[model samples]
Target: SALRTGWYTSVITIELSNIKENKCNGTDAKVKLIKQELDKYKNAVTDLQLLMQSTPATGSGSAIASGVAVCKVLHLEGEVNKIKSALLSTNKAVVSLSNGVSVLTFKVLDLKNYIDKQLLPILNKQSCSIPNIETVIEFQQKNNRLLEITREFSVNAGVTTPVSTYMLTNSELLSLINDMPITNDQKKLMSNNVQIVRQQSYSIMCIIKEEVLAYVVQLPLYGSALRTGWYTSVITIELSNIKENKCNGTDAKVKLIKQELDKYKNAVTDLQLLMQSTPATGSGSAIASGVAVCKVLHLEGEVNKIKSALLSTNKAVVSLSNGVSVLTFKVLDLKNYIDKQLLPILNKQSCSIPNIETVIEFQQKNNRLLEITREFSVNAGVTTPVSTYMLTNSELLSLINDMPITNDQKKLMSNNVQIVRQQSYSIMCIIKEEVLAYVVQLPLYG
Candidate 1:
């Protein structure tokens, strides 16, 4: 009915206008064709109006003749309605395709900016030692690998760029960056930044690949065109053809991204475990282990970065892989340094361990001493029980045996383990002096 047709047309018209607000591109041909079809439908509407005016009044004609004229007019109206419905369906499909493609193209451009503006510069600027030459090469190759895939997507999607002729190979691109002039520490920082940026770029590439295929599959298939009408088949055919071309590109790039993603995942996993394997505890040599705490902190920070990147968008993954790489190497270096500088010192301490018998005896003495002091502290009218007075016999023994103390302190306790009264009195005297000194020094007392 004309009423239904008008309702559908009005709804679609508003929808098309809203879609236009989203900034579509490259839909000129299909939009022009749809407008032409709509014009034809408007002409049909005018013809239908004329036909209604020409139909004879029911009372002015023979009943049978009037019935035949009514049937003929009704048949003509049905045909016009079919054409009108087809026109509207075609317009809707074209607008949908245009919007989908435009959003996808916009996302691709965003990825390109992430690579060129954010990722490329960091890789090109950072300096490394001769020892890290391979590291630099690997980083560059990985970066350029994704760059090529991104460019291929843009080209296959019909995005134009004048610099297509000026494309640079990975080596050529790497050669353009000047050797880093800063300190070794700064170079390491930059290298880490490159790694971070690369991971971010990878994340971005993953999204790009997903967006590409998602839109490619949405391209109007020939089967879909059959639903709209044979009259709109031309536009649908063009849309259908985009699927094969874009999918070919999307599949190729997605495979590359997946392969590289696997490699990145493996590398990060290996590094994550490697860092965890050598436990850094700031033990043994002060000079060598001075930075152990700092390095461990940095290693953990980068490890977390890689893991986070794995779960995040491409941009979020940027700024930290090379940092992780640097940390990985530093972890290795620290491990070797520990073995050389701190391991012997630790071995020496363990070699001089007190006899188990003596350690046990010492624990027994302390437990007895604490039992007596618990009563004495209560008698002295102290509000809070002494720290040691709170320990059970077993807990006191464990504390005495496990605490890190001087070898001389161990030796002193070895003989005194049998002397309970002397040991208890000495402990009480030492505790009194230390506690009093601590209390006097407090700001409240001062």
Candidate 2:
């Protein structure tokens, strides 16, 4: 029987076989039928067990609070350590980035150099072909004009020559072909072969004519610029001819020779002087750029001091072999100490990479680049011819500053200004190992 919405009251059997009999009642027990409750309970247990594996008991190094049961983060040593680890990773990443920047800058220069030196010359030749083509075209037009003008039957190459060869051939061919008697097939064959041969011969005449225009007429015109030779003195030869004509007598020659001797007495002396100077002093002397060396020895020494200072403690920094040296807090304060030791030595002065590294030796000894005078006597009323590159940075920069160029160009032009200055420097210094070490560690072709 189906379930019914009704009240049940009777406890005794009203009909046969069963003890309790159903009746209408205010309350009815609508029995719940939950299908596969045991299997569902098993699946729930399985899911709970999987979750238990992920969240194990809290360990000593975990960020979980030890005593508390809730999901609570301690945010103490463990959290701080993670943050520090990330910072160290970022430090290594920045050094790599800085080194990458350095590599790209050099790569840019190499590509720029290749464009300027290797590729541009070959590319410029392709542009020069245009002038050759133009000259050749001018010859073609002149040849074409001659061909058109001389095509007429009346034209001839010269007055001594007869009428145009093609015109003579044309009239003769017409007369010969018109009166020829033969079998029809034989005549047809003869006319076709003769016309074809004559046409081909006439085509070749223009070919030879055009060849002369380009190869012959155009040749010398273009080649005149290419001519080179020793000069001969026509004036001196003319003077000799006049002398041979008018001054030939031996007594006259003797008189003329004596007069020449009196006038060229000084010239004879100068000739002797030139012969004495023939075995002159050889070219080239030992030269130096007078650059200062060991400005970077201070750099190495400053690094030594920093390493010594921080090497005493493990808390402030971490120096490693492969990765960047790590630095920890009071960042501004560390920089303050750096300038304190090295500022006076640097004195707001930085140097460029010298062409030759002797600047510091001369500089510290107070031998300036521009005014490296050994003595007043050696320097007085004397000048040595030196290149613009060998001149002082002050003069170079001041000379450059006088030019009406862009600020960007001025900066670019100062590329070797550093070489000049280091051959000689005044600029503020940045002595950060984090920056400078990463900077210098970049590609120098390796």
Candidate 3:
């Protein structure tokens, strides 16, 4: 069956017997093979049905559309909530910002006050320092020279001494106390009350003791202008040689008295007057600077008119409980009436915050700071005064001409249109000007 040649190839076939063909072929066996294949297919189908159930098919477009609708509803709901929130937030922010602005504005007012009252005093003090010192020094030196020129009296021994003291009335004393340049009433009063003549008889006895009579001295050379130790006459008892004294004191007394008394009739004048005291210097400085401190004052009835105009429907802004009021508008609503009401009304005038509440807040923050700066300029015992804070007329007019509160961007929030404008004011400016001006002018201790 196998061929072995140099370059040849061969094919081989074997014939089969009937028994081999019968073992290999039967209809039942063929049917069994087909049934096994069908069973495998049925198992595959079951596995495929399980797979399909595990990963079920869905409609992509319908699900996506439903999700979109839910999102829209949520967004609309959020819009409603946001509206409420915006109302609260905007109101709060407006109040806070107004408080802050009001605080700062009063500070500007305080600064205006300080400049008028405090600064001028500082300037005046600078002008008066030199004059006060010079006047005191001149008074002392002149007093010494005056005393030296008033020493021209010598007493004769045993002569009756002249004794006198002047008296002044209440009016004279008061006149002197007031330091008037002339006190002639005091001098007249003193002269008119010369009661020495009334108190005693025609003549008083000269009773000089031996020790005082013997005491006599020359002036000492002290620097002071007092006549403490000066030339003086001495009295001695002139006793006659005869032991019995028949005269008033001695025989020599009658003759000696007569010798001097011969000229007494002619020598004694009825009266004598002398005046040598120096004149007093009067007040030196003229009218004092800042005698009345500057005060800020104004007439305030016009402010109410502006306020009434601001609160009307066309000019209406939101009013806040914290003493702040704002004017707001919905964009669509604003567009409808702005040309007819808002623009035309605002074209004429505007209003300012004038209530005490806003003013107090302003002062706490800004006004007090201005007061601090002003206080720095005050000197001891000096009063610093100021004028009321009056905004310029131009500023008021400008506020009405242009409403700074209404910004164009308010429209961007929503076409729903809730834009607004507000008026600023203070009650203090309206009602307390005169009262405060009086209070500020009170005495420092008060």
Candidate 4:
């Protein structure tokens, strides 16, 4: 009745169903599901391997039984080999997503820290006792926008970071201010800090609204010629705005802002043709370059705000510049890393065929990657190369743990590791089921 092959048929049915479900949803859905299905097949292969190893030998007289056992072993091995092949592709997808998430998470955390540790506390101290409810509320509204972007981006990436709780609405700020007691000297201090910080916040908001927001919108249009040309036009418009507005005659800082804007406009113009020429291949280097351009665009607005604030209030220009530079370099470093490490992997036929192990090994041995890692570790106070797309859970944990970082950083690393682990376990579950059924039928064959 050929019923002995029922387990194999069942396994095939499950895989077929997985494939069907994947196709129904689309590429992203398929990417998410691949790990689950691959893990199932992986477990089946592992179980079958163990079964083949443990299977008892037939007696010398039973040639027919020996022949049947050989056939079963061959079939199981074939299944295992096929599963392994499928696993390679799934592993690649998982790794790519992991890398992308990791890079994005680092940037998000840094941005949050800049807002919280540096900007917000100062602003709050300066403005908490201000009698002007309208001004207080304006500051609060701008603060909320910063928090909103961070929260939305993290959620979209399926990564978690603590949301900002200190952000208050205008009404909330007014209530809090009215509720607090303040001396005259304290009120003066608060007013002074409030003015300086309010301008700083304005600067941040300007960048966030114009450059950062615009870059994000253009991200999906990376390969379009219109994208590069649009930025070129933006630079020209900005230059025209400076001239038409007579910004140079207004103030020294305004002139400086105009000059810096001109410099960036010309620099970016040089790259417009080059950027527009980037073919629609899978190279993420262009994306990396685009991100760098966004940084320049953002900084152009930010410098003017800082300069304006400095003119009206006493704040350390050097300190502020240093902080801004820290952010600028981090983004630039990310662009460099993507170009050096990620682009080759991305540019491959399937965007996953590069030698990950060799790449990782070289990174670890040379310390370029480690240098950047340590810089972030030291600054934020927080936070493998192998060829196949999958790092065994042990490998991943080991790679993360081996870093010279604090326990807090490890915790962050573990959260992402847990994600990878869950996907691996899901794949193992289905594979184990078929292996279980296959093993149960062994005695019948025997």
TM-scores of all predicted structures: 0.12, 0.14, 0.10, 0.15
RMSD (Cα, Å) of model 3? 59.9
Question: Over the stretch 1-446, how does candidate 2's per-residue lDDT look in tens digits?
Answer: 01111111100000001112122221311211111221232332333234333433433221111111111221222422332233332211111121121100000012112323433343245422122334334333423323332343112111111212332244434333333333466445535655442322211011111001100000000000010111100000000001111222244333443343233333223323433343211111001101111123134454453444443442244343323343311111222322343223323333222222233232222222112122111322111322232233454554444334567656655664543232111111122333111000000000
Local distance difference test scores for all models? 0.25, 0.24, 0.21, 0.27
Ranking according to TM-score, highest score first: 4, 2, 1, 3
Q: Which 10 successive residues of model 2 have the least lDDT summed? A: 215-224
- Which residue runs of candidate 2 sit more than 4 Å off their true CA positions? 1-39, 54-58, 65-330, 334-446
Reference-based lDDT, residue 285, model 4 = 23
List the candidate 3 regions with Cα displacement exceeding 4 Å. 1-174, 177-187, 191-228, 231-233, 241-446
Query: All candidates: CA RMSD in angstroms?
Result: 37.6, 46.5, 59.9, 35.1
Could you say which candidate leads in TM-score? 4
lDDT of 2 at 362: 25
lDDT order of candidates, best first? 4, 1, 2, 3
Per-residue lDDT for 32 in model 3?
35
Point out the worst 10-residue segment of candidate 1 by lDDT. Answer: 232-241
- Name the TM-score of candidate 4: 0.15
lDDT of 4 by residue, 180-229 (tens): 24445543443444432221110000012101110011001100001111
Given candidate 3, what's the lDDT at residue 136? 27
Off by over 4 Å in 1: 1-328, 348-446
